[PDB]
């Protein structure tokens, strides 16, 4: 019973996994192992690029799965059934998509929000703390679900910053204001 519907396209896979592993309550274990095998698969780029490539057959995919279960010695047999499903469905390209989505469902079940403090430049830890305090304090996020915030550096935002989470953003980017300023002074 998903916390929020992240409808289809690997999120049908995520949904299925989520309820299946929720009724076995082995979502953390599943998630961790899934992440773990994906990390080392990406760090095995021999068939971490060719994993993406759809050259693989049913049979060739099957032999890829066999290599994969050497890479992780078990942890949730519903994700081992997921491997079967993905090979059978003949798409493994969006594998990490399922993982990310599953992570969202899992940590939503846990109750965790993950925001971002996108800015031009990397920001102060004081700023991080002040924003974290501000967000928890606000009735907008009255907790019940935790706060993670990731400050990211995007030069694309040319001055200012934008805080984002829960479809609630506070965007004080100077770039946008500058655009309107330039426009209004054409006369």
């Amino acid at each position: 019973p998903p916390p929020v519907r992240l409808f289809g396209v690997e999120g049908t896979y995520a949904t299925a996994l989520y309820q299946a592993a929720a009724k076995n309550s082995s979502i953390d274990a599943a998630f961790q192992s899934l992440q773990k095998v994906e990390s080392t698969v990406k760090k095995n780029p021999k068939l971490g690029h060719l994993l993406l490539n759809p050259a693989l057959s049913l049979k060739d995919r099957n032999s890829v799965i066999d290599a994969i279960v050497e890479t992780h010695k078990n942890l949730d047999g519903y994700v081992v059934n997921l491997l079967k499903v993905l090979s059978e469905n003949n798409r493994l390209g969006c594998f990490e998509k399922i993982a990310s989505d599953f992570g969202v469902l899992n940590d939503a079940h846990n109750g965790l929000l993950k925001g971002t403090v996108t800015s031009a430049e990397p920001l102060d830890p004081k700023s991080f703390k002040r924003i974290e305090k501000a967000l928890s304090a606000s009735k907008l996020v009255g907790q019940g679900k935790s706060l993670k915030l990731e400050n990211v550096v995007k030069p694309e935002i040319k001055g200012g910053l934008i805080v984002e989470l829960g479809d609630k953003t506070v965007d004080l980017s100077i770039s946008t204001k500058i655009q309107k300023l330039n426009k209004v002074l054409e006369d």
Binding site: D167, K168, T169, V170, D171, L172, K177, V184, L185
Partner: peptide
């Protein structure tokens, strides 16, 4: 024109949905 832009200040994307 500049004063008009200054009147055009106010920012915050505080909106439940963006």
């Amino acid at each position: 024109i500049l004063e008009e832009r200054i009147k055009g200040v106010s920012d915050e994307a505080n909106l439940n949905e963006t």
